[PDB]
Design a protein that fits this description.
The PDB classes it as oxidoreductase. The entry lists the keywords Ene reductase, oxidoreductase. Two copies of one chain form a homodimer. Chain A has 340 residues and is α/β, with parallel strands linked by helices. Chain A is globular and about 60 Å long. Helix content of chain A is 34%, strand content 15%. The first copy, chain A, has helices spanning 39-50, 81-94, 136-156, 170-175, 190-207, 231-240, 266-276, 289-297, 308-312, 316-323, and strands at 9-11, 14-16, 20-22, 55-62, 98-104, 117-118, 132-133, 160-165, 212-217, 245-249, 280-282, 303-306. The first copy, chain A, has a single domain (9-330), classed as Aldolase class I (TIM Barrel). The longest helix of chain A has 21 residues, at 136-156. The A-B interface holds A 25, 27-29, 39-40, 43-44, 46-47, 50, 91, 94-95, 307-308, 311-315, 318-319, 332-334, 336-339 and B 25, 27-29, 39-40, 43-44, 46-47, 50, 91, 94-95, 307-308, 311-315, 318-319, 332-334, 336-339.
Chain lengths: 340, 340
């Protein structure tokens, strides 16, 4: 009847109607290949809003055309993108939900034709292009791209920003010593590997005072790589720098074996939560409403992030609320249809 | 593995990918009160298309402003409506589904301010306005409105048209002797009560050669009213007149007791099907994929029409296909998410 999953959650001054969040998931549907928002996105994202998702994070959006994963990604490297994005914001908020955006750079895992960049000139695998080692100029400009992305997102009317430092992409690559072999201030030590992310958090916080997430991969799944222990100092640092919540997933820095099963990334989300004393978001194989409730109720995370579950059902919250016997607001058009 | 629910179904030359159909359900979301298509409709209808519904019938659309149920309904009484509707058609078809529209007149059950019309000047209940008995001129013009609605729907690019003669609305009111007390060619006998619908089917068929549904209420649930027996001659007539399928629901002509339970309108849909030798669509409380499969497999109907089920889940076909272990096409963006 009276559950935690469907309880409000305030981040800074922004209040989410529930703890359900849509994770960023690339839709590869910018057919115009210019980072533009499209018909697809205007159907896809508000559908989850209608289904009572409390916070919807728009897919990894490239801060530069270089930093796209693919050519068919969304972009925010130009003021021309603000209008497309502002409409998307309107269409999602109109139907109840809050909206965020994952500012992203794909680093050495970019599949865009041409030069791709990374902290060190070291490919993802045997089959991947070797990226260009970044100059201090490249670094500064990339931090600047992130700041501009944030400025644009603010102007488009987003409620939340997520700095995307996960899944083997640029920022994640600086953090992991597998990929960061630099011998200047940006590599070589725990504090140095953090600096890139740190300057991005500062750079974004200059132009944006709203709710701020950071996505991480808490484990590299590699003997010589990082583990969730390593992100505890980093999360403590993020807290001081003003990061409000940590979106805790894992993996994808280098090819690796991964044991996948229900809530397999929850203990990462909890370790960072308790040890760094910072709010976290759990993600990855959260099927039922029951399972989400246990996560929140046992202080494992503060928001449950959903992925395929919301691709499989955009109205998953209604399904979960039936399963938990909870009362939630139906759009007025579906009140009688959602017979409680 | 290999099921009937997810088998094609060709009507005239139009082939539906499966037997799933979204029933027309009024959304009361024309806030501009001018019959215009709106943001709401452009999210609502393509969401079900994305979820692999084979045929989506747009809500009861008023052929005149008088024939709206409410002021916030969709309309098709003007050529100005063609553009709004053509876009909606585009947004639904773009994402796989076929699209239809229920041409509607609300008769004496209209709640629009001003004059409402009916075959006889007899209200719905004690609490309802008394309608204006229709002149032969009124009749002709109403048939003409229906024809124009069809012409516009064709021009907007709809694949299917449904003449809405159900749920106690205008055409249904001519058919039922509860509501039709006329003593001219339009009332008094079984053949006379049919004539209004008959002239509408002819009038629509003049301007439209595509797939044509007719919605009926097979039972008035009243001792002196019609029963599904009575719609067998009428369905035989509809067949000759070129009607391709009959959308068989029931009730709502006058206030009445209704026993409601799973597939409670299926035997209506089957009687008309076998006895008139015409394709039918079953509707009303069809929860599972299992239950839909039995209907199709035992020749009870040819398409299952869905209502609240699709308000509760727009991707119900995916749910049903999991339940039946059937292979269906996911939009390319959700292929991996819909892991089969």
């Amino acid at each position: 009847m009276n559950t935690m999953l469907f309880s409000p959650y305030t981040i800074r001054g922004l209040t989410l109607k529930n703890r359900i969040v849509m994770s960023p998931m690339c839709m590869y549907s910018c057919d115009t290949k210019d980072g533009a928002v499209r018909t697809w996105h205007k159907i896809h994202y508000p559908a989850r809003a209608v289904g009572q998702v409390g916070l919807i994070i728009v897919e990894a959006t490239g801060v530069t055309p270089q930093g796209r994963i693919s050519e068919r990604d969304l972009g925010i490297w130009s003021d021309d993108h603000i209008a497309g994005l502002r409409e998307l914001v309107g269409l999602v908020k109109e139907h109840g939900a809050a909206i965020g955006i994952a500012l992203a750079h794909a680093g050495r895992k970019s599949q865009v034709p041409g030069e791709i960049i990374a902290p060190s000139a070291v490919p993802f695998d045997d089959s991947s292009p070797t990226p260009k080692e970044m100059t201090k100029a490249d670094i500064e400009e990339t931090v600047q791209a992130f700041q501009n992305g944030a400025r644009r997102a603010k102007e488009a009317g987003f409620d939340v920003i997520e700095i995307h430092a996960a899944h083997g992409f640029l920022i994640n690559e600086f953090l992991s010593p597998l990929s960061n072999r630099r011998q200047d201030e940006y590599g070589g030590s725990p504090e140095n590997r953090y600096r890139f992310l740190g300057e991005v958090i500062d750079a974004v916080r200059e132009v944006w005072d709203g709710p701020l997430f950071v996505a991480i991969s808490a484990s590299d799944y590699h003997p010589d790589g990082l583990t969730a222990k390593d992100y505890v100092p980093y999360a403590k640092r993020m807290k001081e720098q003003g990061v409000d919540l940590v979106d805790v997933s894992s993996g994808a820095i280098v090819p690796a074996r991964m044991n996948v099963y229900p809530g397999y990334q929850v203990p990462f989300a909890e370790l960072i939560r308790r040890e760094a004393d910072i709010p976290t978001g759990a993600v990855g194989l959260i099927t039922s409403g029951w399972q989400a409730e246990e996560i929140l109720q046992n202080g494992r995370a503060d928001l449950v992030f959903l992925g395929a579950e919301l691709l499989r059902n955009p109205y998953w919250p209604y399904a979960a609320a039936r399963e938990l016997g909870a009362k939630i607001s139906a759009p007025v058009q579906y009140e009688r249809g959602w017979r409680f």
